[PDB]
């Protein structure tokens, strides 16, 4: 990168020769089971135009994958996390601004393959009677294949404004018992959605008939640990140094219900059935070069 | 590299042993939702012939993937971004010049694979009646295959000229619902363009019948984050140590139209319908080694 | 990562210009054959706002793969480790908090491929009798394949919280005699579960009809060597500089019962039959920068 | 590799402990639109036999891809670049000599895959009448598949003499509308050359029927950016210390014409229809270690 | 690893700024032909809690692959190494403990790919007489697939206790004359086990009808080179500074007696026929930081 | 890996803060064309236990691939190198010992893949006369695929005893004229061993009908350059500081003869026909740290 312009590697980078006042903050929300951590670093570089501050939103969000409803042996429900989200916003009246919000979006890629073949064949028939036949035919076939990679969960970066930046991880298609994609909105005319259908023509209790959490993706039942980095800059000669931060977590669940139609199991999904969010604003003191919750 | 020409690595580099002053100018265009940033450097190596200046163009352009038209349940229109553009230019009367830029056009490659196959086979026909038959055949086959990668978005570089350099991110073909890829000019005689068609024989409202933004590429919905680097050099003994540089974040949108022909949905696309530009002028002071917006 | 924000690599890291006082603790539980290793380190950085103590949970857990009991020549049982676990709990009364941990859950991945091929063919029929025949045909093919990896054991990170962190390794599935990736849930009406069935139509003694431990995965018999890290931070101005911690090693075994039905061998598996936990308690003295058994 | 001869890595290299007087020169030819750059570094080492000088020739060449003829709706023309050339030469009288250059010609590889197959067949024919028949097959197959990678544009190094070295970027072949690659001299019995043909059986205006520049390779429309390094040496005891050098860019643009034969579009290509040169001259002063012009 | 917890790389490591002793205790057993070497390293870090000691057990073990017995042309025997072993043990009354070791067991992986394809066929049959026909056949396929890599020799670490740690290298399976993998238990009803059967319908002497050692794996006839390592830690404030350690280099052989059944060669394998070990002892003096043979 | 034990990388290595007196000896045996070479290095680290000495017998061995005898057009011979060897030996009564050697036997891996396919088919046949026919069928398929990499020449390490250590290079197999790989023991009843066969039934002279040396592997004709490293350690308190070494570069050839029986060419191989040995004795002076002879 920086070496392509013939510039000495790392010269454009900052933070050299300056001491960094690092720190750490931890908080757990037992109500939502969302272990949130904030790791921050103050890079006060004399050469740089303005002060810098790096925020790491490392933590963990509980999967919360369990059967919430038990209505007899005919049907039962299930709740799983559709998408985890983490955000970061500042009050409008503040003067601090968000500079970078790594990781960013990336351009997808795919492989396209084309094919074209010819053919020529010919055989002679025979038998004891001496009747000899004949046959000569051609053959043509053209086919093209397309291949790509579909992660179960894809991280996305919501439109980052000057005062707020927010990442989000959503649920893509999931392979079940070695079947096809089976995305959130996949529908089957008879069976219906089979996102978490352990058996099709099962006979056990409705609550029992559910895909084992171990078989499913680790995130759904074990939780998602985020690692997003953002840097906010403050003017060097600002009149007021006190500012405010939010660091808002979120987790959108879903509802999955299975009921028996007297012949086979059926399943339906209702997107965004629940929503629980935890927020805790932190206080920044550039003069003290410290962050307190 | 230098090592290959027997020159010790980094010997022909620049910016060694010189102090560098950087900056983190930022700005947000709320109207266009394009959070733009400029991160610059002032490498001033004494050994080099001319003063140097690197202008990073980090930022983000909002996707603006929304359904703007709700004429009724028979038709509806959609607007999506087709190409993000960012460029820098200088007034003609100025003396500064554009030297280099990292992101540059690169050659592409393909894997051509020939094929050839010929075989033979025999046969022996029998039955209880005792008739014996034979058959001798032959076979030939030749085929060709082609393989290459087609990124969803292409990062091409506009014809660069002194005092004006620009970049584009055009929209290449896209794959929806796992079927064949589609592009801007893809046409189908019965269905028409199917770039963002959720279902063929749908029954819901026209506006509702649209490909989910999550399924589509992240850039269209979330946005794009340009990362382009350009370096400007100016004479060491110029009469005036002050130049003005303009930065642009142009975006191009498109209109996607759906209507119920009679039995199936129809898709029409118009190329380059709208366009948004947000130009801001920055002031460069070589003597003070600072950049002001 | 840290270089993407233009920050010099390693600037945000901690532990610089410090004197880390590391240590070690080895304990053996001959009753359960669970070697323990508690390699730790005290990173007391003055720049950082909290004390740190990284705990390495190395060790080894015996596989315990043997025929626990045999009942005649037509019935036998086998105990194998279904899943290991490594929990590092902390008393709720204390003020220390779990800062980070590693490894963590990762997003899975799978490749998707689509195919579309259509061809044409022709034939000409002839014989000595002069009969001439023809045949024109065509065909269309649609095929999509999906491939992904399936590790025998999955390293799942149990839902962490402020005072407790847990890890577990489970049995995803195994390949037996290079035929079929059997798992705990696979069932066959004729033979039943065939996870560890050496032979189908065997005639030897039941206790001798088990898959050789060498053929099976090494972890089942040779044991598993854990490797985890749990950095815990403690306030710098704590009233008392001491915090007891508990590390728990445990494994879960399953009983594999197989018997002869007078025609062929059948096997059944029971999940979570036995559970043995090895608990240890360690006292930590932040003032002394040392933790004792 | 010095490490493979047991010599410590980098010992054979040159340029250690010696200050380098770098520089830069930027010139843009408006008429031809080929923004030229020349990054030069002066390396002199007391240990080396003679002075050195590396002359980068990054620059950049505009694609110049546009329709130039509008005869009517029956025929139209098109000019596109087929070869970018940048060659550096010194006057014959001078004493300075070219020593090394990069990139240089490299060998290309291919993959060969033989094949062989045996086959046996056997079936029994039955029916209600009780007629029983048989069949035996002994088919054999053989096949050779050869695969290689061919870039659209090939970089070549013209025969480097003492006083001049030249590079070329020829147009190997391109892939059009996901069809087999079409070479510059490719021909078809009726359709003709199809290097740039948006539609075969079209009805729009002749000028409109042309492959979109975005679809084609970036180099043709967006221009090509070279990066070639050459080093020239001067005797240390040379009586004169002023050697002139000349750097020449170039561009070869072919002509593509489409005309309608009343049934379908047809195309013809003419090679090397136009040409243009820059022919810039620079003055090198070894005594003062500068290169200005 | 250590950098993912935001800890500067290498901060948690041990052995900095401390002088370390070494040694090359080497002994050879002519009777068993197992070149034994012990490269030990003494580490005494003031910051560390205990005193470390690394025992790298690199050496070599003879393959011992030859025809041990010859009892006529009707049958002949062969001995080959089934599995090598090496392990370190300490007396129970000692106070030193095995701290860590490497290599350790690893989790295997597999690639499972599904498949699904449809089909449609259509043709018209005609002759001079004018008869017409048709076919609208279709087809489906649900083929599976599974591939993995299986080394012929597996290196698995057996359950390491506090006073004993051991490795082994078992024979997984071998490919003979490209006729597929064979293992110690592979059986053929007519030929029997044919792990090292040069020819099926041979006619030469029985001794000569054995697979050439060069064709077989190198380890069988050339030898194995261990590279295992261990760590031993002993409390600095210990009354006794002398400990006795022991090393073993045992090998396990096998018999592959081959006899002719008057029609074709038949091979039988017996598991664990012979065995031999060295069991060298070494003395350690922590005070003097030396190991005595 | 020394870093997988938490030991700082390179801590256990030897050679720090010491001066190594390297050297070189070159001697050529015109009789056998063996450009043997030895590159030694005296390492004596005070922190070590014994003096060290590494011998790198780089050298080089000729190919000697020519037709030794020709007898008209009826038959002709050919001599080629079957195997290269190089070994180091010490006097039996000597005190020095062999410690280590870099190129050592390594385990080999082979891929594996199992395929299972189901199928179904159904078609309807009808003709002009209104006859309607049906056909329903199904099929299953199982497939085992195994692939591995086999080099033409496979380096081996002979059983290293204390006093002598010896490497070896043999001829695994070769691919001729893109046909199936042959080897020394390959036999064909009609043609015979076709390893070095130019044409199956060519009419040229007997001597001319040989595979071109260029087509064959590089080692056979152009020689093989070895690179083997050994380390010798001798106690620092030994009464006698002079040691004697022997170096062998023996090479083994083979005889290949073509025979014209009646129509086609027949080839036979006589393994181990001639052996050439070139042994030179070197002298080591540990006190003076020099190897001269």
CA–CA dist C187, C180 (Å, integer): 12
Q: Looking up tokens 């390592």, which residue turns up?
A: E229
Closest CA to E26 of A289, D51, F161, A118: F161
Which residues of chain C neighbour F6 with C-beta distances below 8 Å? 22, 39, 56
For residue C96, give both structure tokens.
């220390």
Give first-to-last CA distance, chain C, whole Å: 38
E189, E164, E184: which is closest to E174 by C-alpha?
E184
User: Which chains form contacts with chain A, at 3 or more CB pairs under 8 Å?
Assistant: B, C, D, E
DSSP for E186-218, written as a single string? ---TTTB--TT-S-SS--S-TTT-S--TTTS-H
Task: Find, in chain D, the residue whose alpha carbon is nearest to that of B158.
Answer: D222
Q: Which residue of A has its CA nearest to D40?
A: A6
Structure tokens at D20: 């380098």
Instruction: In whole angstroms, give the CA distance from residue D210 to residue D201.
Output: 13
Note whether A1 contacts B229, CB cutoff 8 Å.
yes
Give, as one character, the DSSP assignment of residue E7: B
Cα dihedral F86, F92, F94, F97 sign: positive
Q: What's the CA gap between C259 and E35, in Å, rounded?
A: 49
Dihedral of alpha carbons D186, D187, D193, D194, sign = negative
Tokens of E267: 């091979």
Instruction: Tell me C66's DSSP state.
Output: B
Residue D25 to residue D291: CA distance in whole angstroms: 8
For residues D43 and B154, what is the distance between their CA atoms, to the nearest angstrom? 39
Concatenating the DSSP letter of every residue in A50-99 gives SEEEEEE--B-B----B---EETTTEEEEEEEEEEEEEEE--TT---EEE
**Residue in D with minimal Cα distance to B168:** D222
**Chain F residue with Cα closest to E58:** F100
C-beta atoms of E117 and C142 within 8 A:
yes
Neighbours of chain D (3+ CB pairs under 8 A): A, B, F
Name the percent of chain E in helix, strand, coil, to the closest 5.
5, 45, 55
Closest CA to B290 of A50, F36, C71: A50
CB–CB contacts below 8 A, E to F: 193
E132 and F127 within 8 Å at the Cβ level: the answer is yes
Q: Select from F22, F37, F57, F178 the residue whose CB has the most chain D CBs within 10 Å, as the one to mutate to test that interface.
A: F178
Interface test with C, best of A137, A155, A172, A175 (most C CBs within 10 A): A137
- Flag if B159 and D33 touch (Cβ within 8 Å): yes
Mark yes or no for CB contact D180/A144 under 8 Å: no
Question: CB distance F178–D6 less than 8 Å?
Answer: no
β-pairing, E258-260 vs E265-267, is antiparallel
Does the CA dihedral E13-E17-E18-E19 come out positive or negative? positive
As a whole number of angstroms, the distance between CA E20 and CA E43 comes to: 5
d(CA F88, CA F83): 17
Buried b (16+ CB within 10 A) or exposed e, D219-256: bbbbbbbbebbbbbbbeeeeeeeebebebbbbbbbbbb
The verdict on whether omega for the bond into residue A103 sits within 30 degrees of 0, i.e. cis, is yes
| Token pair recorded at residue B99 | 């030297």
Q: Which chains touch C (3 or more CB pairs under 8 A)?
A: A, B, E, F
Method of elucidation = cryo-EM
Token pair for C181: 């990736």
Chains D and B touching, counted as 3 or more CB pairs less than 8 Å apart: yes
Resolution expressed in Å: 3.1
Report CA-CA distances (Å) from F5 to C38, E14, E52, F9: 13, 9, 11, 9
Distances, alpha carbon B95 to alpha carbons B91, B99, B248, D190, E173, in Å: 9, 13, 20, 56, 75
Q: Considering only CB atoms, which chain A residues are within 8 Å of E113?
A: none
Residue F70 structure tokens: 């020709």
Domains and CATH numbers, chain B: 1-293 (2.70.240.10)
Q: Where are the alpha helices (DSSP H) in chain F?
A: 218-222
Query: For residue C5, which residues of chain A lie inside 8 Å, CB to CB?
Result: 54, 99-100, 102, 229, 231
Per CB-CB distance under 8 Å, the chain D contacts of A144 are: 178
Closest CA–CA distance from residue B155 to any residue of chain A (Å): 10
| Residue F262 CB neighbours (<10 A) | 5
C114, A113 in Cβ contact below 8 A? no
- Under a CB-based contact definition with an 8 Å cutoff, are residues C177 and C197 in contact? no
**Chain A closest-CA separation from residue D180 CA (Å):** 8
Burial of C193 (0-12, 13-18, 19+ CB in 10 A): buried
User: Which has the closest alpha carbon to C84: C271, C288, C293, C276?
Assistant: C276
What residue of C is the nearest CA neighbor of A126?
C127
3-state SS class at E224: strand
State the Cα–Cα distance between residues C259 and C268, nearest whole angstrom. 9
Q: What are phi and psi of A34, to 5 degrees?
A: -120, 85
CA atoms within 13 A on the CB side of B276: 20
d(CA B67, CA B73): 13
Write out the residues of chain C at the interface with chain B, using a CB-CB cutoff of 8 A: 6, 112, 114, 116, 144
Identify how many contiguous H helices and E strands chain D contains and give both numbers: 1, 25
Contact residues, chain E, for F161 at CB < 8 Å: 28, 30, 33, 35
What backbone torsions phi and psi does residue C139 show, to the nearest 5 degrees?
-155, 160
Question: How far apart are the C-alpha atoms of F21 and F16, rounded to whole Å?
Answer: 14
8 Å CB contact between C98 and C243 = no
Cα–Cα distance for residue pair A216/A237, rounded to 1 Å: 53
Which residues in A lie closer than 8 A to residue C3 (C-beta atoms)? 13
**Chain C residue with minimal CA distance to A18?**
C11
- Shortest distance between the Cα of F156 and any Cα of chain C, in A, equals 27
Q: Cα-flanking dihedrals φ and ψ of residue E218, to 5°? A: -65, -40
Q: What angle do CA B92, B96, B100 make, to 5 degrees?
A: 110
CA A176 to chain centre: 18
Pair type for strands C164-171 and C75-89: antiparallel
CB contacts of F115 in chain C (<8 Å) are: none
**Which residues of chain B approach chain C closer than 8 Å at the C-beta?**
39, 56, 178-180
CA C102 to chain centre: 14
Best CA proximity match to B166, nearest among B279, B65, B52, B257: B279
CA of A176: which chain E residue's CA is closest? E114
* Secondary structure (3-state) at A232: strand
Closest CA to C60 of C180, C222, C242, C274: C222
Element (H, E) at C218: helix C218-222
Q: C83 to chain E, minimum CA–CA distance in Å?
A: 13
D interface mutation test: which of A5, A6, A123 has the most D CBs within 10 A?
A6
Pairing of strands F97-101, F251-260: unpaired
């Amino acid at each position: 990168a920086d070496s392509d312009i013939n510039i000495k590697t790392g010269t454009t980078d900052i933070g050299s020769n300056t001491t960094v006042k690092t720190g750490d903050l931890v908080t757990y929300d037992k109500e939502n089971g969302m272990h949130k951590k904030v790791f921050y670093s103050f890079i006060d570089d004399k050469n740089h135009n303005k002060k810098l501050l790096v925020i790491r939103t490392k933590g963990t969000i509980a999967g919360q994958y369990r059967v919430y409803s038990e209505e007899g042996a005919n049907k039962s429900g299930l709740a799983w996390p559709s998408a985890f989200k983490v955000q970061l916003q500042l009050p409008d009246n503040e003067v601090a601004q968000i500079s970078d919000y790594y990781p960013r979006n990336s351009i997808d890629t795919k492989e396209y393959m084309s094919t074209l073949t010819y053919g020529f064949n010919g055989n002679v028939t025979g038998d004891d009677t001496g009747k000899i036949g004949g046959l000569i035919g051609a053959n043509v076939s053209i086919g093209h294949t397309l291949k790509y990679v579909q992660p179960d969960f894809k991280t996305i970066l919501e439109s980052p404004t000057d005062k707020k930046v927010g990442w989000k991880v959503i649920f893509n298609n999931m392979v079940n018992q070695n079947w096809g994609p089976y995305d959130r909105d996949s529908w089957n005319p008879v069976y219906g959605n089979q996102l978490f259908m352990k058996t099709r023509n099962g006979s056990m209790k409705a609550a029992d008939n559910f895909l084992d959490p171990n078989k499913a993706s680790s995130l759904l039942s074990s939780g998602f640990s985020p690692d997003f980095a953002t840097v906010i800059t403050m003017d060097r000669k600002a009149s007021k140094q006190q500012t405010n931060i939010d660091v808002i977590y979120e987790r959108v669940r879903d509802d999955y219900q299975l009921h028996w139609t007297s012949t086979n199991w059926k399943g339906t999904n209702t997107k965004d059935k629940w929503t629980d969010r935890s927020s805790e604003r932190y206080k920044i003191d550039w003069e003290k070069e410290e962050m307190t919750n």
